[PDB]
Design a protein around this ligand. Structure first.
Ligand SMILES: [K+]
Ligand SMILES: [K+]
Ligand SMILES: [K+]
Ligand SMILES: [Mg+2]
Ligand SMILES: [Mg+2]
Ligand SMILES: [Mg+2]
Ligand SMILES: [Mg+2]
Ligand SMILES: [Mg+2]
Ligand SMILES: [Mg+2]
Ligand SMILES: [Mg+2]
Ligand SMILES: [Mg+2]
Ligand SMILES: [Mg+2]
Ligand SMILES: [Mg+2]
Ligand SMILES: [Mg+2]
Ligand SMILES: [Mg+2]
Ligand SMILES: [Mg+2]
Ligand SMILES: [Zn+2]
Lengths: 149, 57, 79, 137, 48, 119
RNA sequence: CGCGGGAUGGAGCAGGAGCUCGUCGGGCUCAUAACCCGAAGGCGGUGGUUCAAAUCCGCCUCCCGCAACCA
RNA sequence: AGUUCGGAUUGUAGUCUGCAACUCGACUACAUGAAGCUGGAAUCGCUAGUAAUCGUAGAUCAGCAUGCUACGGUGAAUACGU
RNA sequence: CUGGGGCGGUCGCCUCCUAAAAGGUAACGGAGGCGCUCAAAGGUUCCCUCAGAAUGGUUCAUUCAUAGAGUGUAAAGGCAUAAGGGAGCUUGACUGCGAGACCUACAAGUCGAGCAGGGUCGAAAGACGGACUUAGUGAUCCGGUGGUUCCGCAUG
RNA sequence: UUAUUGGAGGUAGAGCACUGUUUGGACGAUUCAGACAAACUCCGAAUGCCAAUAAUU
RNA sequence: CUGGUGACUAUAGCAAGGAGGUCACACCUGUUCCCAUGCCGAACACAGAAGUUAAGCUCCUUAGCGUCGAUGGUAGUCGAACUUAUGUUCCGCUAGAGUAGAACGUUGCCAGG
């Protein structure tokens, strides 16, 4: 992926310069992206915009299906993030205070039409989880990666 | 992965999607919004709007 | 006048220890009656369907510690 | 009248009244206290009357801690009924008081004023009491 | 709801197995493999 | 952040749960397998005495080479079974070590089975 | 004193919330009533069982039925 | 097709009268684009150049008419009977 | 039965407290439940770990969290060996028994290693004679139904 | 029966680690202090009980 | 000294600071083959070796939370005498709480150095 090459390039060099690291293994990287649409139509829309079959999340009457979700990591996650940065985001900037206090970020999209690939426009949420130990470190890494903060 | 989704080309750049053009790589892929310049000048302001309307310098 | 809505109890089940530590028992002797594993089956001791602990061989009963908060009962051959 | 907002069991065995006070034998919140020297049940009505006497004598200027609470319900049979046919209904709430227990504590007044307020409270109680101060050394 | 069930296989008249089932949950004639002492083998015993 | 898993400790908990009802005695010792990222080691233990009688490894000078991991596990199983046969060992109980009975662990078990251990 | 039953729009009745009258607005009438057309508006409470309570557990505040004796 | 029906409401920029359009004028341009898809109980007008419908003019009047008064164009249906 | 009798309530089984740290232990003492359910909620192999809170997001993610969840059902005793959650295969919710024990006036009730016959799951050791355990039940006589190398009144 | 030794169990007491009850502070529910319980227990005796091999009986 | 695998009531844990990595243990690289995801090569599994001690892991130091824990005294109590007092006395046993203190594991077997 283009973002994968960007991260393997001096992006990590920027993180090391700005946070004074002693090894390249302590440079934070995005662990995964979990897309949750909180239902055949919703499952199909999520699958067609993401790429894989979603997982139906039941309730903890209890036990009924309520939402759907997808986890991405590796080449697919990197391609998804590049597509979200380039093709998808401007159709919908973004909150820079929505941090977990540990280094993971969450963003909610209300209309699914902002994806290149509906009768009732439902809203989904994206969680980008990284190996960053601080909100500051995660935000700096994401901004370097190109998040439209 | 269990056993569509290819590498379509959306400027131009490679990407993966399901909503399915030669490249420098030599292969072809399936191929509005460049998002805003200043676009429009901001509001003049009431004093400037008043002075310009009546020519009062 | 009035009346009471209580006045019920089940038959007592005579649970608890049936043989002593250091006692000799024939195989099959029930060593402990219990609900759940208040005491665990140790060496040469079995656990029945109703949690009864019984000796699998003839020998001497030994009630012993099992970790910090549990205990067990074993049977060791006299020889 | 002090009483628990709820209890698990409303019908309880009456508590054992032999022995000495398990705890609460020292002044810990105030400066002076009233220490029981004999044993009795202490009812919430007795507690309220004693507290009113104390607070009235100090004009609500100092401050009082009631160290005992009536956790225990007790039952009483309806009048003119024979024995049996189940336990009676809750009649009131008591605290078990044994020698040594501090019943009340007061602070914010002089020793003489506290002594008089505690004497007035003591005369409302079914136990003998002694004026005490915080123990040092 | 729950009724008594007797299972007998084709090549026996032993009818030695009784069991229970929920008539609402299992409206069919239940089948199971059970040991048949006459034939010294497992056989397909089916509810009568 | 995102914590890791410590595969070795997850394995250890699984292995303790297996050892709850798996143990080796004098007449039937336990062939315990440990498998790291690059090497596989097998031991023959009499848990009744707490004593190890035979051992083999993919890092042993005689049984170390540059080969497939499955093949190295096969060689280690053969070496351990040969050592057990040199001793008085015919029947054992296989302690998979908390890993799935697949891949390298399966290869070692099968190699010992072929070379002579009865399990 | 013992046993049991009831608390439903504002009123009388049905009962895990509907009929009639009452209110509001409009109409008919010289006007009122009657009549006609629309709108709103409710599980006695106190704690619990329960995914969920008018509904079920116990109690509380009143009313209602039988009985409250052999001396 | 709540739409190329509807133009209420609101924003902006103007024109004219008037000493002066904030309360509180009329009109214009651009934008916006509400309720409304023939209306319950009930109730009104009209017998012929009438009803219906379409425009026009005047008084008052600096400016302000969906009102009033007046004018023509198109132009029906029905009345068995008390 | 009954702190006289009547009226009221109760009558069998399970769990807890009273019950005095083995077991047992009464009252018209204090609290509740049962007269079922499940074709998997049984067996086996493999994998897995919860409630709650905070922090962000129009259920999803992170960290603390030994259980503060769950365990079909009342309570108690147990259970993160998981006995709790999921998945594949399956029917041991087998047949003949059974050394030896618990309980016990009797009749009953309870546990049970092992042996044989045939299976299921598992690579294998092995586990499995229903369910985390303890309620969900009713004698004999009589009658119905199926089987039967048994009897069957001179013989068939 | 006693002596010694081993064991099972949760009472007395105590305690607040669970459930429930309760009194004062402080802080932005947490923490601090202090209390209550047959059906509370992080704890836990004396006894009594079950057994094993010497003295007496 | 490291590693595997056992035994022992956490004196063994947890937390906070440092040192280490050649072989080893790891993080790691990939998804072509066995295998695997109610979705995901995250985990499971297989191939490996660019890289890094950053983490897990090992060694050193902290009594901070947890854990262990006396002696002395107290509560309670078997027995005995007095006694009817919400009791007293004698004798034996002897808590819980709290204090001193202990503790940052010990140790069997096998393999490597
Ligand atoms: K009586
Ligand atoms: K008892
Ligand atoms: K407490
Ligand atoms: Mg069982
Ligand atoms: Mg059973
Ligand atoms: Mg205290
Ligand atoms: Mg138009
Ligand atoms: Mg009577
Ligand atoms: Mg006793
Ligand atoms: Mg007992
Ligand atoms: Mg009942
Ligand atoms: Mg019943
Ligand atoms: Mg089960
Ligand atoms: Mg004859
Ligand atoms: Mg004959
Ligand atoms: Mg007590
Ligand atoms: Zn058959």
């Amino acid at each position: 992926n283009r973002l994968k090459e960007k991260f393997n390039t001096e992006v990590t060099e920027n993180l090391m310069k700005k946070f004074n690291y002693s090894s390249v293994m302590e440079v934070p990287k995005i662990d995964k992206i979990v897309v949750n649409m909180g239902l055949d139509n919703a499952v199909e829309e999520l699958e067609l915009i993401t790429g894989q079959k979603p997982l139906v999340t039941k309730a903890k009457r209890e036990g009924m299906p309520i939402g759907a979700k997808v986890t991405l990591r590796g080449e697919r996650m990197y391609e998804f993030l590049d597509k979200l940065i380039s093709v998808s985001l401007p159709r919908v900037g973004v909150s820079k205070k929505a941090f977990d206090g540990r280094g993971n970020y969450t963003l909610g999209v209300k209309e699914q039409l902002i994806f290149p690939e509906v009768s009732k426009v439902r809203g989904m949420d994206i969680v980008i989880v990284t190996t960053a130990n601080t909100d500051e470190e995660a935000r700096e890494l994401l901004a370097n990666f190109g998040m439209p903060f | 992965m269990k056993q569509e989704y290819h590498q379509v080309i959306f400027f131009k750049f490679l990407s993966g999607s399901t909503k399915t053009m030669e490249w420098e790589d030599g292969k072809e892929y399936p191929v509005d919004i460049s998002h805003p310049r200043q676009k429009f000048a901001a509001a003049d302001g009431r004093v400037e709007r008043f002075n310009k309307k009546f020519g009062l310098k | 006048v009035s009346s009471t809505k209580n006045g019920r109890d089940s038959e007592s089940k005579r649970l608890g220890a049936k043989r002593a530590d250091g006692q000799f028992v024939t195989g099959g002797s029930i060593l402990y009656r219990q609900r759940g594993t208040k005491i665990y089956p140790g060496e040469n001791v079995g656990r029945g369907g109703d949690d009864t602990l019984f000796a699998k061989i003839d020998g001497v009963v030994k009630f012993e510690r099992k970790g910090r908060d549990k205990k067990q009962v074993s049977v060791y051959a006299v020889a | 009248m002090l009483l628990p907002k709820r209890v698990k069991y409303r019908r309880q065995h009456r508590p054992k009244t032999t022995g000495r006070s398990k705890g609460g034998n020292y002044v810990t919140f105030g400066e002076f206290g009233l220490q029981a020297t004999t044993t009795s049940w202490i009812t919430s009505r007795q507690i309220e009357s004693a507290r009113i006497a104390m607070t009235r004598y100090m004009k609500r200027g100092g401050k009082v801690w009631i160290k005992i609470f009536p956790h225990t319900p007790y039952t009483k049979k309806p009048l003119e009924v024979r024995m049996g046919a189940g336990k009676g209904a809750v009649e009131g709430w008591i605290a078990v008081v044994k020698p040594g227990r501090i019943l009340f504590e007061v602070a914010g007044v002089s020793e003489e004023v506290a002594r008089e307020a505690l004497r007035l409270a003591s005369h409302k109680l079914p136990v003998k009491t002694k004026f005490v101060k915080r123990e040092e050394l | 709801v729950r009724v008594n069930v007797t299972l007998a296989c084709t090549e026996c008249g032993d009818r030695n197995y009784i069991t229970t089932k929920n008539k609402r949950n299992n409206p069919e004639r239940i089948e199971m493999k059970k040991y048949c002492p006459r034939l010294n083998k497992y056989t397909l015993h089916r509810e009568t | 952040m995102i914590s890791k898993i410590d595969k070795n400790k997850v394995r250890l908990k699984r292995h303790a749960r297996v050892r709850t009802n798996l143990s080796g005695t004098a007449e039937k010792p336990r062939l315990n397998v440990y498998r790291s990222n690059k090497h596989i080691y097998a031991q023959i233990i009499d848990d009744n005495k707490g004593v190890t009688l035979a051992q083999a490894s993919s890092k042993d000078s005689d049984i170390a080479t540059t080969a497939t991991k499955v093949e190295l596990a096969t060689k280690v199983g053969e070496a351990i079974a040969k050592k057990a046969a040199d001793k008085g060992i015919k029947e054992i109980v296989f302690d998979r070590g908390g890993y799935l009975y697949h891949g390298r662990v399966k290869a070692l078990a099968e190699a010992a089975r072929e070379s002579g251990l009865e399990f």
